[PDB]
Amino acid sequence: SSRLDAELKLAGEFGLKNKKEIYRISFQLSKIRRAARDLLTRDEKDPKRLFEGNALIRRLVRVGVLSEDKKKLDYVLALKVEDFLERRLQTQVYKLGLAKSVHHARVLITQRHIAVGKQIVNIPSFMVRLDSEKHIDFARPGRVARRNAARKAEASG
C-alpha cells in the first residue's frame, strides 16, 4: 500500500542519510513548519513578507538550504526532507573523506573523535555551515581520524 511503500520510503531515507528511528520524523515536521509558516507567504510585500523573506531565506544555511534562488522554498518540501537530511554531520561528514562510510563515522562522532574545528560535537546530528574546519581535533590521540586521512582529496558534494 501507499502506507506500506511509504514505510518503505522512510527506511530508504534510513541510510539515504544514516538515522535509525524517526528523526526522519524530526526533519519531516521541520519541513512542515518551514513550508507551512512559509507557504503562508502569502500575500504581497508587506514589509513583513520582507523580513520573513531574506529571513527564512537566510535559511542558507551552508551544507543547508538550497544554492541560490527563491523566494519559493517549498522546493524544500521537495528537498529539505530529501535535502535538509544531508548538511548536518549526520550526513556531510562522511562526504568529506574522514568517515570510511556513514556508520564508520557516527561512531567517532560519538566515541569522542570527530570534532568541528575545536570542541568535539558528539551531538551526532548537528548541522554544518561553513564546513572547512570539520577536522578531527583529537587533542595517544584520535586514531581512526588522524592517519586514515584519505580525505586528502575528499573533493565531494
Partner 1 sequence: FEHNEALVPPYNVLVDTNFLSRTVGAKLPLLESAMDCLYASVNIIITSCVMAELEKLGPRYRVALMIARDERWQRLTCDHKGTYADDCIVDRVQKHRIYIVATNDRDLKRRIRKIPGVPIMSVQ
Partner 2 sequence: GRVFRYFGDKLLISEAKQSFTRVGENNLTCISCFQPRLFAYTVSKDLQLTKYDITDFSKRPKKLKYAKGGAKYIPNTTEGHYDEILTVAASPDGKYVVTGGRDRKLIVWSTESLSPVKVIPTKDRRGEVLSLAFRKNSDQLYASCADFKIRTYSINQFSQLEILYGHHDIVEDISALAMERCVTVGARDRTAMLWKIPDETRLTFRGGDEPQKLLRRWMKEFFCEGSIDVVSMVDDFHFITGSDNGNICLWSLAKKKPIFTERIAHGILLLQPFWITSLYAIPYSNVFISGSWSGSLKVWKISDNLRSFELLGELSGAKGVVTKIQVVESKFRILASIAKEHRLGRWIANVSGARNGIYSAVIDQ
Partner 3 sequence: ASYVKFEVPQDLADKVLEAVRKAKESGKIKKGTNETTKAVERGQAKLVIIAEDVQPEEIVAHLPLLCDEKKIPYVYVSSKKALGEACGLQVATASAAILEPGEAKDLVDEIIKRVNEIKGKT
Partner RNA sequence: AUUCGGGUCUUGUAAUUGGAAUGAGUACAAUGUAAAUACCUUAACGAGGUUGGA
Interface contacts to partner 3, rule CB under 8 A: 67, 83, 86, 94-99, 101, 150-157
Give me the residues paired with residue 115 across strands.
Answer: 120
Cα-based angle 110, 116, 121 (whole degrees, multiple of 5): 30
Looking at the Cβ atoms of 1 and 132, the one nearer to partner 3 is: 132
Which residue type is seen at 81?
V
Cα-based angle 26, 31, 36 (whole degrees, multiple of 5): 130
Given the rule CB under 8 A, which residues bind partner 2?
117-118, 130-133, 135, 141, 146-147, 149, 152
Given the rule CB under 8 A, which residues bind partner 1?
1-2, 4-5, 7-9, 12, 31-32, 35-36, 39, 72, 74-79, 81
State the minimum distance, in angstroms, from the CB of residue 157 to partner 3.
0
Specify the DSSP class assigned to residue 115: B
